[PDB]
Amino acid sequence: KTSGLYTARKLRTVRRVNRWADKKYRKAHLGTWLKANPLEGACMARGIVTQKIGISAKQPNSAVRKAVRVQLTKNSKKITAFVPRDGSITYIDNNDEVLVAGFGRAGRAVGDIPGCRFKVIKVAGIGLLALFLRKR
Amino acid sequence: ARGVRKHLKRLNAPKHWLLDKMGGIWAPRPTNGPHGLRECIPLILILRNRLHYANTYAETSMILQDKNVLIDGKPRTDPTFPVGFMDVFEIPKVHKTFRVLYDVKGRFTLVPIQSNEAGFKLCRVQKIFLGDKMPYLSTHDARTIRFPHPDIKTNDTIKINLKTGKIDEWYKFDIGKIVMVTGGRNCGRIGTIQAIDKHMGSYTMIRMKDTEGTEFLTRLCNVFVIGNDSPAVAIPTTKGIRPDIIKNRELRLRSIAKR
Amino acid sequence: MQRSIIVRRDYLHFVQKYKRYERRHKHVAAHLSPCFRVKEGDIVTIGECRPLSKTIRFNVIKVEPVSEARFSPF
Amino acid sequence: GITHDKMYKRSKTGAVQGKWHKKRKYNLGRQPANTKLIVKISTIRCRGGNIKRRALRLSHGSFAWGSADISHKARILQVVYNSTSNELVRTNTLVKGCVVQIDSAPFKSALSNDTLDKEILDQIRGDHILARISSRPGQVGTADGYILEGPELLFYQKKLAPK
Amino acid sequence: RISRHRNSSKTYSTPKKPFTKPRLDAELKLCGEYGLKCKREIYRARYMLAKIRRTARNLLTLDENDIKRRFEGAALLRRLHMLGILDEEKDQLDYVLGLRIEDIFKRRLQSVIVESKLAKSVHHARNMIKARHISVGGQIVNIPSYMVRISNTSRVAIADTSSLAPNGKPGRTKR
RNA sequence: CAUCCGGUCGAUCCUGCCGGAGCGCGACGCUCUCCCCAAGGACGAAGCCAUGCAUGCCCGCUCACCCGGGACGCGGCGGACGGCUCAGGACAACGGUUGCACCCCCCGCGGCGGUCCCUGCUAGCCGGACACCGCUGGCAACCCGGCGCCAAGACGUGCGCGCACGGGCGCGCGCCCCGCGGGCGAGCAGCGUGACGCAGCGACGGCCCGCCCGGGCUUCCGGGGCAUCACCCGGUCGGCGCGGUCGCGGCGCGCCGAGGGCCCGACGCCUGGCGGAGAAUCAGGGUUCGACUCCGGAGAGCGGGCCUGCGAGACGGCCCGCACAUCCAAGGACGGCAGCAGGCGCGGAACUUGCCCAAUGCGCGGCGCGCGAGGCAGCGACGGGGAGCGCGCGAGCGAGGCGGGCCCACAGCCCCCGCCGCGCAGCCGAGGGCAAGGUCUGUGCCAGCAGCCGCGGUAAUUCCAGCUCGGCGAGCGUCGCGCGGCGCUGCUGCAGUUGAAACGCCCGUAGUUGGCCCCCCGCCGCCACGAGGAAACGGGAGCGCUCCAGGCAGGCCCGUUGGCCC
RNA sequence: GAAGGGCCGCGAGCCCCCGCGCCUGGAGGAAGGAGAAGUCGUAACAAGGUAUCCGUAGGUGAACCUGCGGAUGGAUCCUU
């Protein structure tokens, strides 16, 4: 490493250039992710579900995980979001407003749902969890 | 900002004033006058908040508009009037006479005086100006005096009679003068000068020895001659000896037990 | 320039995180009156003055000539 | 909208500066009042409300001869040698440092006087005593000057020389 | 608004690891012994002790009689001695280390009323303070965790209007 | 305020990430027994705005109504501060530190106050006249026309010490310098004497100088990324003379040179860039955020230009172009919520079209009005704080309810009373990490679960129920972000034989780094301690707001406090 | 001394022309990644049945094959 009393500039430059090498820093501070994310820095976003589809489970699990093809209103970007809980796809109908929020992996995919980056939270302005518990 | 700032926020007010964080978003702006905002206290603080004569501002205005207030022999009818170092605050209906001196905590404490003690205000020469073809001198309270004795030089002491608006006595600023400090870390402290260092260029630094033994160094302007070989004014009880932090705790702890 | 010189100022700036300094330089435009004689590489003293040009706010007071021919903090 | 702000200018390196504020009234400039010389003093309200006098057309001024200590009002006959623009000489504009021919008649009496030099006494007969204006008429509202004396005269005679 | 000017602060610190069972069991003992409704009350006193002991750690490193050591040591030991968290015999910065959540809990006043026999159980004592039946210097306190002081220990007593020849009617007797 | 643990294997030891575990700050779900405090349309929409309201006050002068109060008017002062937002701007703003012998300033406060001639003046004291108004009016509206009456502390004049007196203009030190001032570290000021000009202001005389505060510039240092930007600039860099300005300066203009800046990264480009004090997290060294509370900057749909001013290139001023509007009687007129409410658009998201100047300050007024500054309520699980859902075998509460006090600008709220008296839990989980079922059904790689490893293919510790039980608790779960974890950014403190990574070699300029060597100082850097520098905040002294989050209170009192540190 | 008129100054807007930064519609081409699995071989791993591999050149449905120079990370630490 550089070891001079007058080598502060070189050390600052190295950190600046080397810092972007870590993948998480590049995702967080490059700004490419902020443009790309269907939810642009938002915790979640509203959308209309064009198609109710089921995504086959990746191995070794076997299941038709239920998903919705939703067009987010803020960016007009269509996306796939998992409808969580047992048999709760029934509440979702196509042409219905929904709110889609992340799967907790920060844009990554969780478990055996291939290429699913988000989960529906509220359908027709009512939380999905409440409907499955029959609260509403 | 397009002009002068009439308002003043409570947080943006001097610390020697001692405002309370709450109670208002505003603190009184001292109207321009004898003393500068940084080094003056408005009368409203000395009337409704320290002697507590009035409850509110509206009350303070009535007892100020009535000619009862007396600063430096003048009737003074405005609440935010600036008051400053060695300014006699006389209240006649209450028959109490005081002069506004600094205190060893660095704030300004009203120092009670007699009728003989009142009537003279000590002043400091800042500059000698030759405008209008006559010699004039400069005092902190903005007092301007024509034709000074040529012996008076600079940073010297004046004592206005306050009856004819003329100087009564003059103390020459040199090593050996009891002096009180009107600004800085060392403030409200009476001690006598040990050295005055010129530092050709700017900022003359004078070092001064307190009675007990504390030696403290501050700027020339921060000094204010109070007398020659004698205080020449009532010294606040503490005579600016200045407490150590532990002695200050013990003063508070002894006081609490007595109450 | 005409009766004017640029004085190179060399100083060390301390970056806090790395316990190290950086050699750093600033160039000051000064007025060299015809009385003193200045050749490049010579120490000069520059004193502040009323702005005398867009860039010249300093006037040379003294010249300490050096030998016929590094980073020197003055 | 004439301004004396430095924001509009480039940096010492030639880099375009970015504009942070809109034009300020304190940073203002005024259209130059080139003072014509006839062959009116306008009042303008400045900052602080101070009124500076701007001479637009001014016929005569208090010129002076220092070595002989005689100073009289004289008429400004004509303007020669501007030193900045030849255009100003032929438009007879009045600026400081502007050589001018004052009428010799107020100073005519000194012709009898002697020992106050010899070259300056020759000018007294002609009606053309050379004189540089000493006051900015745009700012001070007056065109008071001083007769050229000694080497300055010789330089300004050589400049004015018929060539 | 000068409401913005008012400072507010969290008074407790949570555990770094949520499910350390040895600690979770040890805490349950404190809650049952001291009648504390929630673990937050256990954490608030842990925070108070932490700061108090962090200050005495810093103070102990400072050289003895270091002016600030003298000034800040007194205000620590003396304010703890008044509170009674420390018994007054020790009176030196070395023994502030060694205090426990129980020492703070001991002065809570829920404990002080049980200690002097006024209240049979901590659970009864909490119920008593919330019905305005306990007093310190004849102050009707509604606060179970009053944090009573050494001098005010003697004054703690049944309230003037609750049990000793008072109205003694509103409530069960009135029916 | 020095901590790890689950996951590649058949096992193992690593590298290395993935995932947890903590703490904030906001959204969402479900749920909130009461009180105290408190954030609240910032988040690539500085998008657009209906309506209401946010700057008045004053009496110098007073021959409509009413009395001593005057309305209307004219006049004065203020409306440049405040409130709001963060668009623009990257040697700029902004911070710390200098200067103005290069400067402008209202008020207030303290000084000082002589005002030329000469004609004509009235100096117990001058005009003529405007608005309101009386009349007579057009115009859809907006807007205002004439004719007369008639006041000011308004307007214009104006006598007044030829030591009269504004600006500016001459001549007024040097003998190598520095060693006194009216003064200065500094040749600065003032004056004399020439000449110019008649500047003030005088009809209830006051210019002027000072100090203050608030500027304007200014010195040094600090002041984002990107080299897939390496050369750049052309009033650009200097000189000189003028002009302009409050002044300084390429600030402008001629003229005259050819500079000036840069691998110590210039210039270009870009930003979901206001900066600081600070905020989050937190052994240490750091990382991240700097909307917003105070300070400094900037702006009022977007550009320009001005006027009034002591101060504004002002937008609750004006004018113009642009962009989008509004009303029309068709000719015209008239906008400007990044004030406080309220709507619309947008978004995951963010309150009442309340009440009031009583406080706190500011404006005007000396005996009180005005203020969407503010204060007060309303809404409010941003949050922070303190109590509940029993105790004990007997008593009781507080949540309420209802009157009274008290409080409050007015209510109410808290609190104090009498009088009755109605306690009530959620949200995630029980294979491991990670605390808590080897329970019983349903279902059979389905449905679903599961951050991660993994569960479910007929005896499922993982799903769906019931049952118990854990964890936190009036909150809990979820999603996004920052910090810690993370020594996975490494200055401290990483790694490069094989895990990812020594350039194929050699010369080489900047850059960085340099053997030993002189005891004594000159300049460095260095280090120690000084002054001098806003509070808030943070740390901290004292103080029982019932405790508490707090707040600077309080008690017959250090000069009772409100220290001190940063 | 009003309306006006001229010359300059400051300077909006428009109109061309130019540079820059962004953001997008594309017939058609060409990738890459994921689903559970299809079709064709079997290239690599055991000397994987031609030891692999590297640089470079050419040729083929496809893995790949072949020349030329390396390397051992090879199947050889070994033989006048």
Main attributes of the structure:
part of a larger assembly, 5 chains, C: 74 residues, mainly beta, 4-stranded mixed β-sheet, 50% strand, D: 163 residues, alpha+beta, 5-stranded antiparallel β-sheet, two-stranded antiparallel ribbon, structural constituent of ribosome (chain D), ribonucleoprotein (chain D), Ribosomal_eS8 (chain D), ribosomal protein (chain D), Ribosomal_Se8/biogenesis_NSA2 (chain D)
Summarize the structure.
Chain A: Belongs to the universal ribosomal protein uS12 family. By secondary structure, chain B is an alpha+beta fold.
Element layout with pairings:
This is part of a larger assembly, with chains A (136 residues), B (259 residues), C (74 residues), D (163 residues) and E (175 residues).
Chain C: E1 4-15, E2 20-31, E3 43-48, E4 58-64
Parallel strand pairs in C: 2-4
Antiparallel strand pairs in C: 1-2, 3-4
Chain D: E1 35-36, E2 41-45, E3 51-55, E4 60-62, E5 73-79, H1 86-91, E6 93-94, E7 99-102, H2 119-126, E8 129-133, H3 137-140, E9 145-147, H4 151-160
Antiparallel strand pairs in D: 1-6, 2-3, 4-5, 5-7, 7-8, 8-9
Chain E: H1 21-34, H2 40-61, H3 68-83, H4 101-106, H5 110-115, H6 122-130, E1 134-136, H7 152-155, E2 156-158
Antiparallel strand pairs in E: 1-2
Helix pairs in contact in E: 2-3
The structure holds 2 RNA strands.
